Amino acid sequence: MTEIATTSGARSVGLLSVGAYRPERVVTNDEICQEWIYTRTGIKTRRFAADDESAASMATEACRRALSNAGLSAADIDGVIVTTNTHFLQTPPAAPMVAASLGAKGILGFDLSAGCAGFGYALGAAADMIRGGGAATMLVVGTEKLSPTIDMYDRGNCFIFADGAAAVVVGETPFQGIGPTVAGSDGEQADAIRQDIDWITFAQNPSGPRPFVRLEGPAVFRWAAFKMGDVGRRAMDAAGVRPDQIDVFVPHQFNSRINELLVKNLQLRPDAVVANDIEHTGNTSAASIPLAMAELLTTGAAKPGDLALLIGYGAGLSYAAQVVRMPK
Amino acid sequence: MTEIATTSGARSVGLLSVGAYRPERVVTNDEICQHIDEWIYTRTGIKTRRFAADDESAASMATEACRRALSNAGLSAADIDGVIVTTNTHFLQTPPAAPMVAASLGAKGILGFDLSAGCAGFGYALGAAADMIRGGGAATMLVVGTEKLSPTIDMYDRGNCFIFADGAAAVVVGETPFQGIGPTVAGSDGEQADAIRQDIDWITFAQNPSGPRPFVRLEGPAVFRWAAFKMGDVGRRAMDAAGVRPDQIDVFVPHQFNSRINELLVKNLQLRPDAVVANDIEHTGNTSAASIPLAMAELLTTGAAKPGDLALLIGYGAGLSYAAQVVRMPK
Ligand SMILES: *SCCCCCCCCCC
Ligand SMILES: *SCCCCCCCCCC
């Protein structure tokens, strides 16, 4: 029964920085179709990536900005996790591609897919790896090129999804910066948000329709609005923080009315800042939460060290939540 | 500034069991390779491999492997707090497979995500699961490598038609009396991402689906050279991290990519003459993320390895990615 070593890393880990990338093309409600969109969803405009851009290329840019904001270079990073739904290759994964693009072609890394909640899972996994001693400093980047997956004839969701990327640096902090991860799924509602035709079935029958994103609105709305408050409470309990201590709330930027209901259910202070990046960023799935954090810090709405509650929710029916201290 | 709480989990974690699902369709070298009518065997060690049915998926096979893993641990779905699915052949951008897998086992509600790191998916997934359990995020998890690679194969690709295959195998990861999973050794060579790849991205394809379709492409010489050059060091780093010597390893479970690579690695790692070396590749081929746990499953089934034998795992593949650890054999 030979000894296998037990190891550990730094106990206190937090967000050292965030960097964000949004593509340049402003897309209006009048272009992604064929008066009440803003009212119903909270969206006015979104950003679409260029043809030559990819989830991977945007991840690279966000990571560059996150390193710069941390006072770090790529040689300081031990690992990278890319989280996404729009890396349109079965292999290779985007993480080593990003690693090489940053000039650290040899560092560990993998891709994490958990629908919209990928970021919360990816954060928790980096936190755990570092505390476990598998790394000291990591990049976690949510990146999405959703624009090509949208059926422009589907008024059900055509105005929802968008493009962009955002990265956080995660590493040793003087005090705990990332609370315990509260996560879960509802695999019985896997169909509620989906690619409608798998790629192989499509490739094997090219005379058929191509795949696009499909959404089941009432079922999604119902689930989020009514279960996400209890998830938020578990995240606050686990972190040992009270609802009234939360300065910033970053729900997934999926729909404004869902997020409005959550705020009331969660019993946060009246002055708690609630992320509304959705209005000019739309729904950027895995990139949503860190894009919203960056946006709040940019505008002055949040400050480094603010207590933020993050709740990711979406496809698979997956959610991941945690309390953090704001970076930068 | 009030301080954020931390949680804690098990210190000592291990592979409690393995469960293996192999689809029933047996495929010979003749059938998958247009160019061949015995050298494929000599050059790679592959004689046959299993192909999933048309109706089967990476997700469906994962469920089956999970059921078997649970039964092999004497546990139920009630005992699992998390599932990581690792694959390269879940052919949906969304939804992920992990939640539908969890539902399939009656553990709807439980956390889960999919992990992709080419062939090295399993080692990263095993590493991630151990980390999560020690961090207090879960107490007992399923980690399942699953692959339906058969429909990605170009039967005219003389360099790779014979390589890839279907299967799934899961491990139950949980608290043990003594440390059962050593630290994770991992890394990449992102500058060689094109070495193993889908050749046409899905969106580029979606715009011209009546033209050429995507298939798996592999630059074999490049991959052979890199594995033979690099994996010895990788193996040594995993043993060093676990605090073990080469002569202490009982079972060597390298990725089932090519038998000749794996022989070169045995010699390079300086393992014991009598160290048991995984050769599941012979009738299973390269099942990517399912390879290591399927190979563990095979050594146990044949009784070539026993539960508790000290094992060295090395995964290597696309991305150019690798992930390694010393573990005790499950079952
Ligand atoms: S909440 C996550 C939504 C992500 C959707 C991925 C795109 C699916 C359509 C592929 C054509
Ligand atoms: S070593 C990892 C091999 C994974 C191959 C995934 C399939 C890519 C081609 C899809 C058409």
Side-chain angles (χ1 to χ4, degrees), chain A residues 89-92 200, chain B residues 88-89 91 117-120 147 149 151-153 164 196-200 202 213-218 255 257 286 288-289 316-319:
Chain A
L89 296 163
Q90 299 298 145
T91 216
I200 281 295
Chain B
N88 295 272
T89 52
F91 302 118
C119 289
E147 227 61 88
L149 278 151
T152 71
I153 299 168
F164 294 112
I196 310 168
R197 70 185 190 285
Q198 174 170 340
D199 58 351
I200 309 168
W202 288 121
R213 56 152 282 187
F215 287 109
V216 65
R217 301 311 174 175
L218 164 146
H255 195 88
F257 221 119
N286 185 356
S288 192
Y316 59 94

Side-chain angles (χ1 to χ4, degrees), chain A residues 4, chain B residues 15 180-182 238-239 242 244 248-253 276 292 296 299 305-306 308-314 324-330:
Chain A
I4 292 179
Chain B
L15 303 178
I181 314 302
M239 300 180 286
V244 312
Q248 297 182 286
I249 308 298
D250 299 319
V251 181
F252 181 39
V253 190
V276 176
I292 290 181
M296 278 191 298
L299 292 168
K306 302 146 276 186
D309 279 346
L310 192 65
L312 176 59
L313 317 178
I314 314 186
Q325 53 269 116
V326 178
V327 300
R328 309 197 194 277
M329 288 290 289

Side-chain angles (χ1 to χ4, degrees), chain A residues 39-152 154-158 160-167:
Chain A
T39 270
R40 288 269 90 196
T41 192
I43 305 165
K44 284 180 183 291
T45 57
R46 69 248 71 203
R47 300 304 187 78
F48 276 14
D51 298 336
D52 40 290
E53 289 183 295
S54 66
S57 76
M58 298 183 283
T60 295
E61 250 308 300
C63 283
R64 264 164 200 157
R65 294 175 172 186
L67 291 172
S68 157
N69 291 343
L72 305 184
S73 81
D76 301 313
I77 297 315
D78 298 317
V80 60
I81 301 166
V82 171
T83 187
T84 186
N85 299 275
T86 52
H87 180 67
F88 309 111
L89 296 163
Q90 299 298 145
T91 216
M97 290 173 63
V98 172
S101 295
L102 300 167
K105 68 170 188 156
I107 67 173
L108 68 86
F110 59 81
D111 289 4
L112 194 153
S113 274
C116 286
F119 182 79
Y121 276 117
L123 222 212
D128 295 340
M129 185 180 298
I130 294 162
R131 288 198 196 97
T137 317
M138 295 186 79
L139 279 162
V140 176
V141 58
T143 178
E144 226 61 278
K145 190 173 180 184
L146 285 155
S147 53
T149 75
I150 297 166
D151 183 4
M152 278 321 167
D154 194 332
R155 228 90 170 187
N157 61 52
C158 70
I160 298 176
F161 300 103
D163 300 346

Side-chain angles (χ1 to χ4, degrees), chain B residues 81-123:
Chain B
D81 320 306
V83 57
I84 305 163
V85 166
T86 186
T87 190
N88 295 272
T89 52
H90 179 65
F91 302 118
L92 291 175
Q93 298 302 137
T94 219
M100 46 191 287
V101 169
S104 290
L105 304 159
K108 166 206 84 189
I110 71 164
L111 71 81
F113 61 80
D114 296 3
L115 194 157
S116 280
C119 289
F122 181 79

Side-chain angles (χ1 to χ4, degrees), chain B residues 12-36 38-42 44-46 48-104:
Chain B
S12 290
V13 301
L15 303 178
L16 302 181
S17 79
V18 67
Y21 176 84
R22 311 170 192 272
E24 66 167 329
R25 162 116 172 270
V26 172
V27 167
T28 62
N29 292 332
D30 323 61
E31 177 177 6
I32 192 56
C33 289
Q34 148 78 18
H35 78 284
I36 101 103
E38 205 194 87
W39 288 347
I40 294 317
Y41 171 85
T42 307
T44 196
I46 308 171
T48 63
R49 81 233 76 206
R50 305 301 188 93
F51 273 15
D54 282 357
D55 40 289
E56 284 183 292
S57 60
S60 76
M61 293 189 297
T63 288
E64 189 47 54
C66 284
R67 297 190 172 124
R68 294 165 189 205
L70 286 175
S71 162
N72 293 355
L75 298 180
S76 44
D79 298 295
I80 305 296
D81 320 306
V83 57
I84 305 163
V85 166
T86 186
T87 190
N88 295 272
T89 52
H90 179 65
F91 302 118
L92 291 175
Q93 298 302 137
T94 219
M100 46 191 287
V101 169
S104 290

